[PDB]
Amino acid sequence: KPLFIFEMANNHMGNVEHGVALIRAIRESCQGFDFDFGFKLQYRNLDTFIHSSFKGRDDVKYVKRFEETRLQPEQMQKLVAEMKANGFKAICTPFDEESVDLIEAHGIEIIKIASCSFTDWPLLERIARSDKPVVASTAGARREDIDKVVSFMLHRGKDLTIMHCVAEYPTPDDHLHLARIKTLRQQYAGVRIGYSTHEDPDLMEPIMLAVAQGATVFEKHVGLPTDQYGINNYSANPEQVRRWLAAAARALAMLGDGEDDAVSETEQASLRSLRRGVFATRPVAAGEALTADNVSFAFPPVEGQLTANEWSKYVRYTAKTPIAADAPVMAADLEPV
Amino acid sequence: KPLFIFEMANNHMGNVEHGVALIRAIRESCQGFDFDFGFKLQYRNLDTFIHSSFKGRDDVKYVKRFEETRLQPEQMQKLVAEMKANGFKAICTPFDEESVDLIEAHGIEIIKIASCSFTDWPLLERIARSDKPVVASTAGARREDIDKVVSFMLHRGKDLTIMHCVAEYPTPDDHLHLARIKTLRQQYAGVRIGYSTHEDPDLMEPIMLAVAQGATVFEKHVGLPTDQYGINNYSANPEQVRRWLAAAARALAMLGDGEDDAVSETEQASLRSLRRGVFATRPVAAGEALTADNVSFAFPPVEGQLTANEWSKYVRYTAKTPIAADAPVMAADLEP
Ligand SMILES: [Zn+2]
Ligand SMILES: [Zn+2]
């Protein structure tokens, strides 16, 4: 049931072979874990998306990075092909209306909304008229906005998932604000809650904290280090992904199931072995009632001596058969009153 | 603020001076942290609590250990004194009703109830007569019991805390069942929840998990390995107590404040730089309306271009002054 999502973003680096080699290593990292898994792309129609005025420029963030790692629809369909080949849910973040169109053509199963497009209303309209599940990130979103967006998606019957994240790239430990996962969970009932992250140096605890807080979907950026290919400071390599899942794996075990009222057999005998048994202080005749004079409490009990945990201060029991003084009051020897 | 209770139990090994040195070793472990701390004893009037039928016997668990580590009241009084002097809160688990009297006499501040005495009504009824906050452990209680005891104390006006714990000494990782913390927060709303634990072969993650589920009171057994005395495996030394607390602190750091909605400049400025700005696709006369006909969306914007995230179907825009084809719609040029 937990779903983990692996964000490639642009870490294919403009290169498909690399990106195929990265999906396949991520599948290797998943060996043995019993979760759901999705792989994520980012769709921008670079023609429309980067404005004429900013083409070829680098005096501002992201333009150059976007232009350099550009991939053609032909090649983007190729990656989906592998994604699915390996058993990943194909997941994608459109930033354009036209990229939604494209997501459809590619038979992608799910739509992520990035935090930046969270209130990109025209983009939302385009997504709403789609018929796939939605995963929305909410970094620095106002409550009133997330409300609008939740309400609007939920009305008109969408499968929605809302994710905590922070738009600091990478995110200081100081600054993960994981408490927010619960804030979101409490604000919005019957909406899946998740956590998308820019934490990683190889951290490991945030995920446990995240699971504990009742997030059910988890997104992390991934990439494959290589000689002549670097990695950024918020993207995990295949070695740290496996660890990432090992951590969640552990946290689930340590957490157990909150459903279980059910009780261990150790616990029960242990607990008895520390309880106070009820003893007669004085001979008690047949049909004598048991009172504050005549009994006392002391440990430890024998089976199935009546214990203090069953005593009452009002008159509850008479002795069916006589009890010797200083003897354990056995519970099979008492008729209730 | 979070409360950390250190369970001494009978880890004073029956020696007052050792108990003292323990308290002192643990005060050091606490240096620097902005938490509350308590040290906890275990009170049993043994003359009376261990039944004659069982005195001198090592035939079944605990009897021996209790007898062997016996401390007199004057000696318990010295420990409480020490605890207070290092600025610890004084806490105790009484197991019989004479022990509650001694708690009152010794000036102990909080009453802990062990899981085995959780439904010990006669003890409960004695404990209810004190006016000390109650902290209550819950291992293997059935729901109806927790319900009963909970309302019992709450209706009495008690300042109650409910702990999750597990009666396996020590508790396997497998078996911590840390999500009872959430369960219990959810069934007993308003009631403070903590977690008392019997875990570590050095474990640091469960406290981080405890804290993340909103436990606020934590208990752990503690000891001072000495070679003259060893230490059992569900109780922690001073080194590993600091680690424990550091794990807690780190978790709080990573969690931050649920009720804080202030967003950063760094964050806000980050988001803007990935957003679609708004560009005029044909010329736009002054006092002319802006529609889907005349605007495209593209990236990136600049201070302070209109942004798409402000293209609501509920909002009309008219140009103050004329806008050229292919130009940024600059907000200061419109009319909400
Ligand atoms: Zn991201
Ligand atoms: Zn204990």
DSSP string, B135-158: EEE-TT--HHHHHHHHHHHHHTT-
CA B169 to ligand 2 center in whole angstroms: 8
The structure was resolved experimentally with X-ray
CB B178 within 8 A of CB A257: no
Q: Is the dihedral of CA B111, B116, B119, B122 positive or negative?
A: negative
Q: According to DSSP H, which parts of A176-215 are helical? A: 180-187, 205-212
Is any Cβ of chain A less than 8 angstroms from the Cβ of B177? yes
Interface mutation vs chain B, best among A181, A209, A310, most B CBs within 10 Å: A209
CB B308 within 8 A of CB A119: no
Binding site of A for Zn(2+), by residue number, is: 198, 221
* Cβ within 8 Å, pair A267-B167: yes
- CB pairs under 8 A, 24+ apart, for A81-86? A82/A20, A82/A23, A82/A24, A83/A23, A83/A39, A86/A23, A86/A24, A86/A27
Amino acid at B297: F
Q: Within its chain, how far is the Cα of A32 from the centroid?
A: 18
Helix (H, G, I), strand (E, B) or coil at B158: coil
Chain A residue with CA closest to B314: the answer is A121
CB A321 within 8 A of CB A335: no
Residue numbers of A between 1 and 20 with CB closer than 8 Å to B: none
Total residues belonging to chain B? 336
CA distance A86 to chain B (A): 31
| CATH architecture designation of domain B257-336 | Alpha-Beta Complex (3.90)
Instruction: Copy the structure tokens of residue B31.
Output: 């240096």
Instruction: Copy the structure tokens of residue B319.
Output: 């140009």
In angstroms, the CA A169 to CA B267 distance is: 9
In angstroms, the CA B180 to CA A242 distance is: 28
CB B330 within 8 A of CB B304: yes
Q: Within its chain, how far is the Cα of A125 from the centroid?
A: 28
Per-residue burial over A95-110, b if 16 or more Cβ lie within 10 Å, else e, is bbbbbbebbeebebbb
Contacts of B50 in chain A (CB under 8 A): 298-300
Instruction: Copy the structure tokens of residue A30.
Output: 């998943």
- As beta bridge partners, residue B296 has B279
Is any Cβ of chain A less than 8 angstroms from the Cβ of B126? no
Instruction: Copy the structure tokens of residue B301.
Output: 């914007």
Q: By C-alpha distance, which of B1, B16, B168, B136 is closest to B83?
A: B16
Instruction: Copy the structure tokens of residue A15.
Output: 């290169």
CA distance A79 to chain B (A): 24
B182: Cβ contacts below 8 Å, ≥ 6 apart? A212, A214, A258, B213, B214
Domain with CATH 3.90.1210.10 in chain B: 257-336
In angstroms, the CA A82 to CA B250 distance is: 40
* Cβ within 8 Å, pair A253-B313: no
Interface mutation vs chain A, best among B267, B272, B278, B315, most A CBs within 10 Å: B267
Query: B17: exposed, middle or buried (C-beta count within 10 Å: 0-12, 13-18, 19+)?
Result: exposed
In angstroms, what is the C-alpha Rg of chain A? 31
Interface mutation vs chain B, best among A46, A118, A270, most B CBs within 10 Å: A270
Task: Say if residue A301 is preceded by a cis peptide, omega within 30 of 0.
Answer: no
Please report, to the nearest 10 degrees, the dihedral formed by the alpha carbons of residues A203, A205, A211, A216 taken in order: 0
In angstroms, the CA B145 to CA B119 distance is: 7
Domain with CATH 3.90.1210.10 in chain A: 257-337
Strand (E) or helix (H) holding B186 = helix B180-187
In angstroms, the CA B249 to CA B208 distance is: 9
Give this entry's resolution in angstroms. Answer: 2.5
DSSP structure class, residue A302: P
What's the distance, Cα to Cα, between the start and end of chain B in Å? 47
Is any Cβ of chain A less than 8 angstroms from the Cβ of B179? yes
DSSP characters over B273-323:
HHS-EEEESS-B-TT-B--TTTEEEEB---TTB--STT--TT---B-SS-B
Q: Within its chain, how far is the Cα of B50 from the centroid?
A: 35
In angstroms, the CA A259 to CA B334 distance is: 57
What's the distance, Cα to Cα, between the start and end of chain A in Å? 52
In angstroms, the CA B88 to CA B80 distance is: 9
Greatest Cα-to-Cα distance within chain A, rounded to the nearest angstrom: 103
Task: Say if residue A2 is preceded by a cis peptide, omega within 30 of 0.
Answer: no
Q: CATH top-level class for A257-337?
A: alpha beta
Instruction: Copy the structure tokens of residue B125.
Output: 């009824």
- Minimal Cβ distance to A255: which of B115, B123, B178: B178
Please report, to the nearest 10 degrees, the dihedral formed by the alpha carbons of residues B156, B158, B161, B164 taken in order: -30
Q: By C-alpha distance, which of B128, B136, B129 is closest to B161?
A: B136
Is any Cβ of chain A less than 8 angstroms from the Cβ of B122? yes
Instruction: Copy the structure tokens of residue A64.
Output: 């150059």
- As beta bridge partners, residue B162 has B136, B193
Contacts of A259 in chain B (CB under 8 A): 183
Tell me the angle at which helices A17-29 and A238-255 cross, rounded to the nearest 10 degrees.
30
Amino acid at A179: A
CA A119 to ligand 1 center in whole angstroms: 16
| Cα within 13 Å of Cα(B314), Cβ side | 3
* Cβ within 8 Å, pair A119-B175: no
CA A314 to ligand 1 center in whole angstroms: 66
Amino acid at A237: N
- Supply φ then ψ for residue B253, to 5 degrees: -55, -55
Query: A87: exposed, middle or buried (C-beta count within 10 Å: 0-12, 13-18, 19+)?
Result: exposed
CB B309 within 8 A of CB A119: yes
Is any Cβ of chain A less than 8 angstroms from the Cβ of B212? yes
| Yes or no: domain B1-256 corresponds to CATH 3.20.20.70 | yes
Q: By C-alpha distance, which of A299, A311, A325 is closest to B96?
A: A299
CA A324 to ligand 1 center in whole angstroms: 76
Please report, to the nearest 10 degrees, the dihedral formed by the alpha carbons of residues A279, A285, A289, A293 taken in order: -50
Contacts of A312 in chain B (CB under 8 A): 121
DSSP structure class, residue A201: S
Angle ∠(B151,B193,A251) on CA atoms, nearest 5: 135
Query: A229: exposed, middle or buried (C-beta count within 10 Å: 0-12, 13-18, 19+)?
Result: middle
| Ramachandran category for residue B214: left, alpha or beta (phi over 0 → left; psi -120 to 50 → alpha) | left
* Cβ within 8 Å, pair A51-B277: yes
Amino acid at B227: D
- Minimal Cβ distance to B276: which of A120, A174, A268: A120
Per-residue burial over B245-257, b if 16 or more Cβ lie within 10 Å, else e, is bebbbbbbebbbe
Chain B residue with CA closest to A314: the answer is B122
In angstroms, the CA B178 to CA A251 distance is: 9
A138: Cβ contacts below 8 Å, ≥ 6 apart? A115, A118, A146, A162, A163, A164, A165, A184
A58: Cβ contacts below 8 Å, ≥ 6 apart? A64
Instruction: Copy the structure tokens of residue A303.
Output: 């089976």
Is any Cβ of chain A less than 8 angstroms from the Cβ of B142? yes
- Supply φ then ψ for residue B256, to 5 degrees: 60, -160
Angle ∠(A97,A99,A101) on CA atoms, nearest 5: 80
In angstroms, the CA A49 to CA A71 distance is: 14
- Supply φ then ψ for residue A320, to 5 degrees: -65, -40
Instruction: Copy the structure tokens of residue B59.
Output: 């035939």
DSSP characters over B20-85:
HHHHHHHHHHTTT--SEEEEEEEE--HHHHB-GGGTT--SSSSHHHHHHH---HHHHHHHHHHHHH
CB B134 within 8 A of CB B127: yes
CA distances from residue B58 to B66, B141, B168 in whole angstroms, order as listed: 10, 28, 20
Total residues belonging to chain A? 337
CA A221 to ligand 1 center in whole angstroms: 7
| Ramachandran category for residue A174: left, alpha or beta (phi over 0 → left; psi -120 to 50 → alpha) | alpha
CB B94 within 8 A of CB A305: no
DSSP structure class, residue B189: T
* Cβ within 8 Å, pair A279-B168: no
Q: Within its chain, how far is the Cα of B97 from the centroid?
A: 30
Q: Is the dihedral of CA A63, A69, A74, A78 positive or negative?
A: negative
Helix (H, G, I), strand (E, B) or coil at B190: coil
CA distance A290 to chain B (A): 15
Domain with CATH 3.20.20.70 in chain B: 1-256
Angle ∠(B157,B163,B164) on CA atoms, nearest 5: 145
